[PDB]
Amino acid sequence: LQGVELIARDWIGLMVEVVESPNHSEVGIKGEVVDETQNTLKIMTEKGLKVVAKRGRTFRVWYKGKIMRIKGDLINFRPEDRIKRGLMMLKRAKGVWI
Numbered sequence: 001l002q003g004v005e006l007i008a009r010d011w012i013g014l015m016v017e018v019v020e021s022p023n024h025s026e027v028g029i030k031g032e033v034v035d036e037t038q039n040t041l042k043i044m045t046e047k048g049l050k051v052v053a054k055r056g057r058t059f060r061v062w063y064k065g066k067i068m069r070i071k072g073d074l075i076n077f078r079p080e081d082r083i084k085r086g087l088m089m090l091k092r093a094k095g096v097w098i
Contacts, residue, residue: 004093006061008077008086012036016043019069020058026050038078044065 031045054072
């Protein structure tokens with residue numbers, strides 16, 4: 001339910017943590033998203049700033065009392081685009097055809 005909402009919502013302002021990545025040294029990067037583009041997430045960490053690509057990455061995200069794991073491959077699209085994708089994932093997660 002809420003996990004799907006994250007597919008459509010920009011992640012700016014949310015707390016995230018990189019748990020999987022093809023760029024191995026990125027594991028552990030955790031902080032607040034301060035900017036987002038179709039392909040990247042800019043994160044403010046405890047000791048600095050990091051830019052992390054979305055493709056191939058898996059992020060743990062703190063949202064409305066829950067903690068979800070979301071693949072960057074699902075959100076590396078423009079906002080308008082992510083809105084339609086969000087709805088698709090909702091139908092799929094609802095077992096509804098439309």
